[PDB]
Design a protein around this motif. Sequence first.
Motif, mmCIF file in Angstrom:
data_model
loop_
_atom_site.group_PDB
_atom_site.id
_atom_site.type_symbol
_atom_site.label_atom_id
_atom_site.label_comp_id
_atom_site.label_asym_id
_atom_site.label_seq_id
_atom_site.Cartn_x
_atom_site.Cartn_y
_atom_site.Cartn_z
ATOM 1 N N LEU A 28 0.824 -1.205 0.000
ATOM 2 C CA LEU A 28 0.000 0.000 0.000
ATOM 3 C C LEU A 28 0.860 1.259 0.000
ATOM 4 C CD1 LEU A 28 -2.823 -1.238 2.403
ATOM 5 C CD2 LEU A 28 -2.804 -1.115 -0.097
ATOM 6 N N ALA A 32 0.728 4.013 -2.968
ATOM 7 C CA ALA A 32 0.486 5.430 -2.728
ATOM 8 C C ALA A 32 1.618 6.289 -3.281
ATOM 9 C CB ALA A 32 0.299 5.683 -1.232
ATOM 10 N N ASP A 33 2.868 5.841 -3.109
ATOM 11 C CA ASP A 33 4.009 6.599 -3.616
ATOM 12 C C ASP A 33 3.932 6.775 -5.127
ATOM 13 O OD1 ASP A 33 4.927 6.773 -1.046
ATOM 14 O OD2 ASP A 33 6.576 5.347 -1.287
ATOM 15 N N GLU A 35 1.157 6.597 -6.940
ATOM 16 C CA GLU A 35 -0.030 7.383 -7.264
ATOM 17 C C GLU A 35 0.226 8.879 -7.131
ATOM 18 O OE1 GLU A 35 -2.726 5.303 -4.681
ATOM 19 O OE2 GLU A 35 -4.186 4.993 -6.285
ATOM 20 N N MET A 70 -7.708 9.211 -0.782
ATOM 21 C CA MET A 70 -8.828 8.509 -0.160
ATOM 22 C C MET A 70 -10.101 8.629 -0.987
ATOM 23 S SD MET A 70 -8.255 9.372 3.860
ATOM 24 C CE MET A 70 -7.161 8.395 4.882
ATOM 25 N N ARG A 76 -13.286 4.286 -6.472
ATOM 26 C CA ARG A 76 -12.986 2.985 -7.070
ATOM 27 C C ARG A 76 -13.734 1.852 -6.380
ATOM 28 N NH1 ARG A 76 -7.737 4.908 -6.561
ATOM 29 N NH2 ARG A 76 -7.170 3.353 -4.978
ATOM 30 N N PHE A 86 -8.031 -1.026 -3.637
ATOM 31 C CA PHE A 86 -6.791 -0.258 -3.692
ATOM 32 C C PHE A 86 -6.191 -0.305 -5.090
ATOM 33 C CE2 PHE A 86 -6.134 0.928 0.693
ATOM 34 C CZ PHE A 86 -6.927 0.038 1.386
ATOM 35 N N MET A 103 -6.257 -0.060 12.044
ATOM 36 C CA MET A 103 -6.555 -0.059 10.619
ATOM 37 C C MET A 103 -8.047 -0.181 10.343
ATOM 38 S SD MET A 103 -5.030 -2.509 7.646
ATOM 39 C CE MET A 103 -3.363 -1.876 7.765
ATOM 40 N N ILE A 106 -10.263 3.010 10.273
ATOM 41 C CA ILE A 106 -10.186 3.824 9.067
ATOM 42 C C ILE A 106 -10.792 3.077 7.884
ATOM 43 C CG2 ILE A 106 -8.561 4.845 7.431
ATOM 44 C CD1 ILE A 106 -6.816 5.533 9.839
ATOM 45 N N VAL A 196 6.635 9.547 5.745
ATOM 46 C CA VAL A 196 5.188 9.387 5.657
ATOM 47 C C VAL A 196 4.512 10.535 4.903
ATOM 48 C CG1 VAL A 196 4.917 10.411 7.902
ATOM 49 C CG2 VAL A 196 3.087 9.074 6.964
HETATM 50 C C1 LIG Z 1 3.127 8.831 0.750
HETATM 51 N N1 LIG Z 1 4.266 8.146 1.387
HETATM 52 C C2 LIG Z 1 5.367 9.110 1.546
HETATM 53 C C3 LIG Z 1 3.899 7.637 2.721
HETATM 54 C C4 LIG Z 1 2.799 6.552 2.630
HETATM 55 O O1 LIG Z 1 1.547 7.185 2.801
HETATM 56 C C5 LIG Z 1 0.459 6.329 2.529
HETATM 57 C C6 LIG Z 1 -0.638 6.818 1.963
HETATM 58 C C7 LIG Z 1 -1.817 5.878 1.672
HETATM 59 C C8 LIG Z 1 -1.727 4.595 2.004
HETATM 60 C C9 LIG Z 1 -2.892 3.635 1.704
HETATM 61 C C10 LIG Z 1 -3.507 3.992 0.386
HETATM 62 C C11 LIG Z 1 -2.704 3.614 -0.881
HETATM 63 C C12 LIG Z 1 -3.173 3.893 -2.076
HETATM 64 C C13 LIG Z 1 -4.513 4.587 -2.204
HETATM 65 O O2 LIG Z 1 -5.033 4.900 -3.468
HETATM 66 C C14 LIG Z 1 -5.205 4.906 -1.131
HETATM 67 C C15 LIG Z 1 -4.655 4.582 0.271
HETATM 68 C C16 LIG Z 1 -5.532 5.002 1.437
HETATM 69 C C17 LIG Z 1 -4.971 4.691 2.866
HETATM 70 C C18 LIG Z 1 -5.925 5.256 3.967
HETATM 71 C C19 LIG Z 1 -4.727 6.056 3.593
HETATM 72 N N2 LIG Z 1 -3.917 3.587 2.763
HETATM 73 C C20 LIG Z 1 -3.888 2.421 3.683
HETATM 74 O O3 LIG Z 1 -3.047 1.599 3.533
HETATM 75 C C21 LIG Z 1 -4.949 2.232 4.792
HETATM 76 C C22 LIG Z 1 -4.656 2.409 6.288
HETATM 77 C C23 LIG Z 1 -5.640 2.213 7.160
HETATM 78 C C24 LIG Z 1 -7.045 1.807 6.683
HETATM 79 C C25 LIG Z 1 -7.296 1.652 5.392
HETATM 80 C C26 LIG Z 1 -6.163 1.877 4.384
HETATM 81 C C27 LIG Z 1 -0.452 4.026 2.657
HETATM 82 C C28 LIG Z 1 0.568 4.840 2.904
#
Ligand SMILES: CN(C)CCOc1ccc([C@@H]2c3ccc(O)cc3CC3(CC3)N2C(=O)c2ccccc2)cc1
Lengths: 208, 227
Positions: A28, A32-33, A35, A70, A76, A86, A103, A106, A196
């Motif tokens: 994940l 996210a990185d 995206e 989010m 999606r 995801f 987790m 959220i 982060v």
């Molecule tokens: C940016 N880097 C510098 C640092 C990393 O920050 C991130 C940023 C997003 C994520 C991930 C993610 C990935 C893709 C997406 O489209 C969306 C999301 C959403 C979410 C909620 C936030 N997430 C989780 O895993 C999650 C946690 C707890 C409940 C449910 C989901 C993970 C890390």
Amino acid sequence: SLTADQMVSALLDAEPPILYSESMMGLLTNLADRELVHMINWAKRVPGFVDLTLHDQVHLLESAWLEILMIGLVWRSMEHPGKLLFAPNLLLDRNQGKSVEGMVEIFDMLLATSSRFRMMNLQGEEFVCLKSIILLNSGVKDHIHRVLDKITDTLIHLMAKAGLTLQQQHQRLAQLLLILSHIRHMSNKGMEHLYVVPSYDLLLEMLD
Amino acid sequence: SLTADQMVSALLDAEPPILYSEYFSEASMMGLLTNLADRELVHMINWAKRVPGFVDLTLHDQVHLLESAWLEILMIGLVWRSMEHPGKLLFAPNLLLDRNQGKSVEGMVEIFDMLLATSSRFRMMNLQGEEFVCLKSIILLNSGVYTFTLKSLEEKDHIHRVLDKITDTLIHLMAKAGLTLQQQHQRLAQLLLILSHIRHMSNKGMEHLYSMKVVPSYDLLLEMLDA
Ligand SMILES: CN(C)CCOc1ccc([C@@H]2c3ccc(O)cc3CC3(CC3)N2C(=O)c2ccccc2)cc1
Ligand SMILES: CN(C)CCOc1ccc([C@@H]2c3ccc(O)cc3CC3(CC3)N2C(=O)c2ccccc2)cc1
């Protein structure tokens, strides 16, 4: 100077691609990185965004990036009840989230927002306006508010074109904007869970 | 069932009083603010019970909505009271604080700056009292609705009807002020986008409270709502 129809067309064209997944948190984070780059590409195509100073563009992205991740996830996942999409190869239900502490809370907020989108039959044209409002509102100056006023006019346009009465236009507009308050709350709770943040320098390099 | 005119009237009569502090040193400031917030909470309960439709909900749902919204309501009340005092936060008529007095506790100045910026935004929009009490009622009903069964569905449907009713009331106030339809839509959006910042501030404020080591308990709120 764009018309509402032209505003909608620009935002729909600007939509980022769906990325695929490459230890659940590692996937994940990696997703996210990747995206983030496409988000910044999307932001530069939001009418009015690149008229801002580069310092102000970064500040808006610093404040909005997780909210945008989010609401994209929620969009999606909208047609997969009880699951979060995801990536096309990363569909997770809430049972999988119970491993990490904090987790599932959220996860549940995201599912409820997806259910809300589903109940209001949110349309793609409305979704891209909503995402643009998050970008411009989250970090907010005079130019930003008249871009925000233009997006508001576009949303009202879409609802009248869909046949809603004037009263239903006001009511749907309010309902969509009140969801943005919950997305901000989820983003705040998501930040806390992650603790982060993309650096100013990283965002700046991605912009130029 | 109420008209927009009647909705404004009910919300205006439900407004809690402005409370005072004791009748100064930075050391005592947190105790004074905590005591003021504790007294304001009691009046916020009785205001909420008078927001149209709130007491139709079950008492569990009333507690959940207040538990989710109580700090936001305190902050927006503070921002309203401070709107005519640039650079200052009017916690009470005898407790008017500036930025420099907020640097004693770590993390206080960040939230202090955010509250001042919201006050300045209210000022720039010339926010009216009638619009303010609508916004406060929206915060109460909206903030916890997404974190709640057949009973829950009927409760959420009821909340969204009352929120629809308040939206019409806001529109009616703006039209009564002579705004065009475009300006009505744009001011409605401007008002509701400020609500997202207020939620952000309350999240940051809630963190700051837990850093002192705190919240109105479930029993305490139940105990107050359940008269
Ligand atoms: C940016 N880097 C510098 C640092 C990393 O920050 C991130 C940023 C997003 C994520 C991930 C993610 C990935 C893709 C997406 O489209 C969306 C999301 C959403 C979410 C909620 C936030 N997430 C989780 O895993 C999650 C946690 C707890 C409940 C449910 C989901 C993970 C890390
Ligand atoms: C309820 N008890 C059980 C637990 C204590 O909760 C509280 C709740 C509120 C307060 C106080 C207070 C008082 C009255 C008001 O009208 C508003 C506020 C607002 C504010 C921001 C949140 N606050 C602060 O001090 C503050 C911090 C950093 C920047 C600026 C202000 C203090 C304690």
